[PDB]
Amino acid sequence: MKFSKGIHAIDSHTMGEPTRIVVGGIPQINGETMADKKKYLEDNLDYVRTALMHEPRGHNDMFGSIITSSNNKEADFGIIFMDGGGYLNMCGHGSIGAATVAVETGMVEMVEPVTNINMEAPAGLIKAKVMVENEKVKEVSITNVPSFLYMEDAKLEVPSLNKTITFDISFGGSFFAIIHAKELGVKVETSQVDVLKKLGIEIRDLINEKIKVQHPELEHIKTVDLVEIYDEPSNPEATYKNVVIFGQGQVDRSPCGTGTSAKLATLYKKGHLKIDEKFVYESITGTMFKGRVLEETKVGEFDAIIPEITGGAYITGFNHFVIDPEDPLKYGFTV
Amino acid sequence: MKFSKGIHAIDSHTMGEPTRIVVGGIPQINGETMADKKKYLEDNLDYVRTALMHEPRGHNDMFGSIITSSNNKEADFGIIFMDGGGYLNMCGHGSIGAATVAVETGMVEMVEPVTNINMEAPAGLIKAKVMVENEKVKEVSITNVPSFLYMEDAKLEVPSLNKTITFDISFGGSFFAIIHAKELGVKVETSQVDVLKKLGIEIRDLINEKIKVQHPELEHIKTVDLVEIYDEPSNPEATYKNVVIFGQGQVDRSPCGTGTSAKLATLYKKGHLKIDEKFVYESITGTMFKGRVLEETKVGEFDAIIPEITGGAYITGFNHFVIDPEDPLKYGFTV
Amino acid sequence: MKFSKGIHAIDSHTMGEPTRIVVGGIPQINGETMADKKKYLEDNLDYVRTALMHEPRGHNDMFGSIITSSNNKEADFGIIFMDGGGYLNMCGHGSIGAATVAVETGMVEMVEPVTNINMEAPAGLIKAKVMVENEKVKEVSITNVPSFLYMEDAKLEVPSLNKTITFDISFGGSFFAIIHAKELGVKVETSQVDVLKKLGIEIRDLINEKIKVQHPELEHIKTVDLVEIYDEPSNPEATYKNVVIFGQGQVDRSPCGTGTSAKLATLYKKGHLKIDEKFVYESITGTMFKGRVLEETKVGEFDAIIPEITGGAYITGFNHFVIDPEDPLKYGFTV
Amino acid sequence: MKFSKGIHAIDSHTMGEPTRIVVGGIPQINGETMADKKKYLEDNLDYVRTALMHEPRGHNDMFGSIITSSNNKEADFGIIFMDGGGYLNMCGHGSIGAATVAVETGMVEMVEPVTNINMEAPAGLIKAKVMVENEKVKEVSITNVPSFLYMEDAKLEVPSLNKTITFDISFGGSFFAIIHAKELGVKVETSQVDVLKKLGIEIRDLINEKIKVQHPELEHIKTVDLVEIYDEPSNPEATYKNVVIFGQGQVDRSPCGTGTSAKLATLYKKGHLKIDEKFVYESITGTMFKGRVLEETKVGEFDAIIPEITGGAYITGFNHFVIDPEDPLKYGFTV
Ligand SMILES: O=C([O-])c1ccc[nH]1
Ligand SMILES: O=C([O-])c1ccc[nH]1
Ligand SMILES: O=C([O-])c1ccc[nH]1
Ligand SMILES: O=C([O-])c1ccc[nH]1
Q: Transmembrane stretches, by residue range (chains A, B, C, D)?
């Protein structure tokens, strides 16, 4: 034994998409807002991330958070998302996990009906509710950033074989790129992964050329890191089924929070029975996220809605990672 | 299984007298100063202390702490000390403890010659210097709050046995009654411990709520709470031994950093010790702290001295405490 | 960090009197019978016991065990009990402990009404029946080794105080001196504990190496080692209280299953108790075992009775003990 | 918190290829030989495996062992390999890990020079040596089963584009299938994974048709589950570099023990400077295994050698997996 470093994480799976919630092993991180500490992390500790998110600890499609000091009064605690490619500003399937764990472990004093909790992200402070059955969490609704559509139609170019064919782009907290099942020839199922993943990243990269758009408000993030594919379900109590590509080439095991929070737009201004209507969006693996909306905030330059998404996270063990200082791969290695 | 609350501690021992350093299972406490953090703990989440310090988890003696976010400028993380009986404003084995582990587990980036780490009691911030021999920590050298003689001798009381007479009172993080082993007829040895305990608290009671206890600054304290007895040593190296009684009726196995730092800060104001002059305080259990007297500096009332005490802590396992909600002792029990 | 040895235990408490159940950090001991396994432990890897039972890790009292591979036919896993002073051939709170956890953590496939688990002391195999209320364990009901009156009263000795006279001796997993609280002038209360301890061991010494200690079968034992004192209860429910002294000078906080199982196995051979007849033994700490007297069966010398004692254990956290090789107390210390 | 199950694992990475060494959470497994317990595991517990080896805990290319009771005298302990597709009979990169951990953690009492250790696999008992530098493991040589070649030339069929082209087949403890870099057009590097993996499994499956051979001795295992591709290094202190496909479609991050133990055959009967000659075989990721041989056992029907392979394993944290009984994915899910 040597190790030199020792980080305590808690694993969750949020409808299939894993989350490593680091709890103990780094007590304070300087910055004022989560962005300030984020910058500090990305600049000073940075690639603790690599170690936990890459092999031989994690894998390509691994994802996780860091619980921290609030700094902002209000109450609760601070979170910082992360993945094989760096850090997410929001992850939704992270906000659920993080919340579900916190309460289940303690950290947040739990109620009998439903325990509200506000967590500090680098992006906006996030409102998770978590309904509990006397003792334990049943599922979390996380209220999402106002989401909208950037353009109607799209089409550009696809390497093989059709060449052309219409698509669609929107927001969701981060932008997105959505298409249909009928053009390439895919049936979103576990078996065919490679064509989707391999078609996904080239579509991501080649719409970073000049179509690339910045939304009104917040000028820093630009163009696409999230490619999306609908089809509609193979499971009865559902209505759509969809996969999402991102993160140095990784994929989401859940229907995609930020993704779904964006999709359930469109059908607000496209005539599909509007507010407080039931919608259950399911993943490629085949697991459910409930979506529904409330406020519908137009405001000039766009038309937008403030979407409420729900899901379930479960605890899949407790970790105490350590870093043999001779281990030459002690940090990450990418593949 | 079912638990509801699950807290991640790190067992250390510091010349005996172990410390359970809490690391994980609570992420936040807005506080401001580490006393306004301590206050919050005692008036809210005290039910932790009862759990870990008392049986079945802890025992009569048994000491620990909590790592925090600092708020305080620079301050590398900030700490709170706790025992079966309540919370110590400061603790020299508790500090020495926290320091070692923090560096050992990589919570602190470890410097190669000596690692300077600042922690927040908030009995001032404290500057621990952690010596590391290429690979490993050699020893800690914690520089403490200014220490002084408070009132001088005063008169003793009876219940048992005989009204008796002389002793002394002095501060060094908390307030101490420093009396000779002869003055009441004790020999610092395991055979008598029971007596020293039963004696100390009965004293610690009846020299409170009869007298004037106060600190030139920080207000609040107005409580000794710490009874220190002293005789010569059965070790050539050591200069003096001592036991310390506090918290419900619990004893230190280390010479008591705060206790020693207070004693030698009565000397010099006596002339038996001058600046540096190697000092080595011993406990009951053949375990020693290598004191010295660096710099004077009065305290806005009467003259004083900042002392640096030195010692060694060792990591004695990693704990994930959990509390079965049916378990009636869930929050420990007294005896 | 650097440790070299890292052992994985599971803290439980069984009506107080905690048990550290070792689970992980050693995988094998060829032994044959669980005594030939115990032998090996004590003549080799005893340095574990000193570590976990003594300070800094454990304390004066503090009890634990080890889960093993059985070898023995059927036997679901097999156990070894241990304390600060050495190893108990059998223990009713140590058994009740092991049972609960084993089922609780899923080591045993948990049956819904009642879960029958066989463990190997090897003070015989023992049949614990673990009641589970749909989700959770309600209580354990361990059926023990045949118990009996051994020699009857005999005469007491002095050192302190007064030579005195009557008492009794009886077996129930180990050998007990069962004497009244009146017989030496004690009241079973925390205030006196110190006396009961100091008394018990001085007795436990001087009623050994002066007398005839022996078991009709299994040979070897030829040692009491367990002093049991008894008075009436300050509880309506409870029928009798008791304390038990053993191992270097340590006390039980449970009524002492093995201790109680031995006491009521002197009654009936007396006529104050017959088959079933609800019995409830209490400790010093307001904690009770619900005894009964099921079936006779002599012991190849003199008549005897197999008693079933019942109680409750709770999981009080999970430990990964580690031993810094520089740490001079690495293997604990005495006081 | 609920979980119902709680398995303690220790993670390693053996030159990139991960290993989850389960230690605590299942104390005894019935069977006599490791095959008997294996059969028992595969039949009764089975898909604890799925949970730990599949997502959301593990991933497709995850691999691990189970430490157990020896049963066989000799000494030490029992191991059982496992992966997403079931169980391996040998894994070499498992035998190293397992050994490296055991000693590093304790479990096996360690020496000053080199600590021999014999572990019970379902296949033959395995001899790992582990050289240690006063305190810590430097690297393990594991002595491998007698390995040989089944046929010289091969060629069969490849879907695109050449159609034909020569290859080669051998043993290694398990069979294998080896080819060159020059025929399809691949440069074994992280970037191009998919073509190799996708070309690998179809080559695996379509040489399970009737070419399928059983080696002399042990009639149970048949044909191929291991496809292999040499090229030779991009790293100076090496001589070959090679990737290996298997396990429901997974891949090896290390040069492949059983694989390499087979390859370093051929060059014993093909004139390449024979016994006790240095050979370092490196992986697709680019990390070294040392191979060299000793005995060369011809025996009629084949010509064979008993190969000695070396490597390094490092500890990448300690796990305490748990299985929320409501979590619908609580066990595995494949992709
Ligand atoms: O669900 C989300 O919010 C998300 C972010 C990145 C991938 N999914
Ligand atoms: O080491 C000390 O200073 C201390 C505080 C309480 C007991 N010992
Ligand atoms: O509960 C018991 O039987 C026991 C054994 C040792 C102390 N208590
Ligand atoms: O290295 C080995 O022995 C092995 C077995 C399966 C894959 N690699």
A: none
Kindly determine whether residue C333 and residue B1, on different chains, have CB atoms separated by under 8 Å: no
* Residue D72 to residue C73: CA distance in whole angstroms: 16
Helix ranges (DSSP H) in D80-215: 93-105, 193-206
Give this entry's resolution in angstroms.
2.8
3-state DSSP call for residue D86? strand
Q: How far apart are CA C95 and CA C81, in angstroms?
A: 8
First to last CA, chain D: 28
CA-derived radius of gyration, chain A: 20
Q: Determine the topology of domain A6-142+315-322 in CATH.
A: Diaminopimelate Epimerase; Chain A, domain 1 (3.10.310)
- Judged by DSSP in three states, B287 sits in coil
The domain made up of B6-132+314-322 has a fold known as Diaminopimelate Epimerase; Chain A, domain 1 (3.10.310)
Contact assignment for A25 to B320 by CB distance below 8 Å: no
CA atoms within 13 A on the CB side of C191: 4
As its CATH architecture, domain C6-143+314-322 has Roll (3.10)
Mapping DSSP onto H, E and C, the string for D147-163 reads: EEEEECCCCCCCCCCCC
- Strands D17-24 vs D63-68: parallel, antiparallel or unpaired: parallel
Query: What is the rounded radius of gyration, in angstroms, for the C-alpha atoms of chain C?
Result: 19
- What Å distances lie between residue D291 and C326, D14, D99, D152, CA to CA? 37, 15, 18, 22
Q: Which of B25, B314, B23 has the alpha carbon at shortest distance from C321?
A: B314
B185 part of contact set with chain A, CB < 8 Å: no
Domain D147-306 has CATH 3.10.310.10: yes
Cβ of A65 closer than 6 Å to ligand 1, yes or no, is no
D318: nearest CA partner in chain C: C320
Fold of B148-310: Diaminopimelate Epimerase; Chain A, domain 1 (3.10.310)
- What residue segments make up the domains of chain C, in order of their start? 6-143+314-322, 148-310
Element (H or E) spanning C52, and its range? helix C47-53
- Looking at chain D, the number of H-run helices and the number of E-run strands are 5, 20
Q: Do domains A6-142+315-322 and A147-306 have the same CATH topology?
A: yes
Å between A119 CA and nearest CA of chain C: 28
- In chain A, % helix, strand, coil (3-state, to 5) comes to 15, 30, 55
DSSP A58: S
User: Does residue B92 line the site of ligand 2, with CB under 6 A?
Assistant: yes
- Please report the number of interchain residue pairs, chain A to chain B, with beta-carbon separation below 8 angstroms: 77
C238 and C197 in contact (C-beta within 8 Å)?
no
Give the burial string for B31-53 (b: 16+ CB within 10 Å, else e): beebbebbbbbeeebeebbbbbb
Give D308 to chain A, closest Cα distance, Å: 23
Ramachandran assignment for D203, one of left (phi > 0), alpha (psi -120 to 50 degrees), beta (any other): alpha
Q: Is the preceding peptide bond at C122 cis, omega within 30 degrees of 0?
A: yes
What is the CATH topology of the domain spanning D6-143+315-322? Diaminopimelate Epimerase; Chain A, domain 1 (3.10.310)
Q: How far is D134 from chain A (nearest CA, A)?
A: 13
Mutation pick for ligand 1 pocket among A226, A264, A290, A308 (CB with most ligand atoms within 8 Å): A226
How does strand C175-180 pair with strand C225-231? parallel
Largest Cα–Cα distance in chain A?
Answer: 63
Which distant-in-sequence residues (6+ apart) come within 8 Å of B282 by Cβ?
B233, B235, B238, B239, B240, B241, B242, B255, B288
Q: How many other CB atoms are there within 10 angstroms of residue D184's CB atom?
A: 17
CB atoms closer than 10 angstroms to residue C329: 23
What is the CB-side half-sphere exposure of residue D86 using CA atoms within 13 A? 11
